[PDB]
């Protein structure tokens, strides 16, 4: 049976909530438990009425994200195909009740400072169900770090980390992320000089440049285990393919072209498309604290430019990681 909000958010945890993100169907908060930050994603489910102008999702509709979140989190503890590049999943609960007054307070503070596109979540009744996903706190999204990175050497570590994580997930799970825009890439400081992964039993390292990248958000993602495929069928979606004003919105169309609008199939080229979009952001929209002033830094810039103009001729993140000159 469902639990009260108190189960996920005891008082001290609830009292420490700050809102960090939102979308059509959810709210994301940061809080603290045992001296450690975590991120809480809260989705209303199963009700007949509108939230932020759209119908609530059913449990069936959210289940794929729950499943995929868990499978990708478990890659940190695997052997042949091992990566910590996906966000850790701590717990998932089904909760019943009105929205806590303490979360409303957090919601109000975000609306005052950043502005919300969503309704104030104060209208839910005591029978309302929610899914509450608790994750590792992954740092700050790449979009919000547009003006905050040291140099293009950092961008290279970020791209290498992303390619490796995706390669490991391809190998283990026939994974496609399918929505890896720059709000779904998180950066956190790390003291580790290098990060470790294992791809089909071969272990390697990546220089961190002081950052650990985490991938999040699996609403559009696809994977499989023992031939059972978990994915989001967007073949009849009326607006996913009609966006404009950012290369991001072309990627949805280019995915649909690659897969012939058959979303259950495996087309790991979609991971390449997203990595090309990310590289394009690094070269065009990111602005660095230190530019490429030295010949050595101009060289890194040239290698990332070369990656950008060649990577679309690779068939998967695995092909990119194993064969592309950038990662030698």
């Amino acid at each position: 049976g469902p639990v009260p909000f108190s189960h996920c958010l005891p008082t001290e945890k609830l009292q420490r909530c700050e809102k960090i993100g939102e979308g059509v169907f959810g709210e994301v908060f940061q809080t603290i438990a045992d001296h450690t930050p975590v991120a809480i994603k809260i989705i209303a489910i199963e009700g007949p009425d509108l939230v932020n102008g759209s119908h609530q999702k059913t449990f069936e509709e959210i289940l794929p994200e729950i499943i995929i979140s868990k499978e990708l989190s478990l890659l940190s503890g695997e052997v042949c195909n091992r990566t910590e590049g996906f966000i850790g999943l701590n717990s998932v609960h089904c909760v019943q009740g009105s929205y806590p007054p303490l979360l409303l307070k957090a919601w109000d503070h975000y609306n005052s400072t950043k502005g919300s596109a969503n309704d104030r979540p104060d209208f839910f009744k005591d029978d309302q169900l929610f899914i509450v996903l608790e994750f590792e706190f992954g740092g700050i999204d790449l979009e919000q770090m547009r003006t905050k990175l040291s140099s293009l050497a950092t961008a290279k570590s970020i791209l290498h980390q992303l390619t490796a994580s995706l390669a490991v997930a391809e190998a283990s799970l026939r994974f496609e992320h399918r929505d890896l825009h720059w709000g779904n890439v998180l950066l956190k400081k790390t003291s580790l000089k290098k990060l470790h992964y294992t791809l089909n039993g071969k272990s390697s390292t990546i220089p961190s440049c002081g950052l650990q990248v985490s991938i999040i958000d699996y609403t559009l993602s696809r994977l499989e285990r023992d031939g059972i495929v978990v994915f989001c069928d967007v073949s009849m979606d009326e607006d996913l393919f009609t966006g404009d004003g950012d290369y991001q919105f072309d990627i949805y169309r280019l995915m649909k072209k690659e897969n012939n609008n058959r979303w259950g199939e495996y087309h790991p080229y979609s991971n390449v498309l997203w990595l090309h979009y990310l590289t394009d952001k690094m070269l065009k929209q990111m602005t660095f604290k230190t530019k490429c002033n030295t010949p050595a830094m101009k060289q890194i810039k040239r290698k990332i430019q070369e990656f950008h103009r060649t990577m679309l001729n690779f068939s998967s993140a695995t092909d990119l990681l194993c064969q592309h000159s950038l990662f030698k």
């Binding site: 059509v24 969503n118 996913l240 949805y252």
Partner: peptide, 7 residues
């Protein structure tokens, strides 16, 4: 941006 927006 989010893939779908409120909106």
């Amino acid at each position: 941006a989010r893939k779908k927006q409120t909106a």
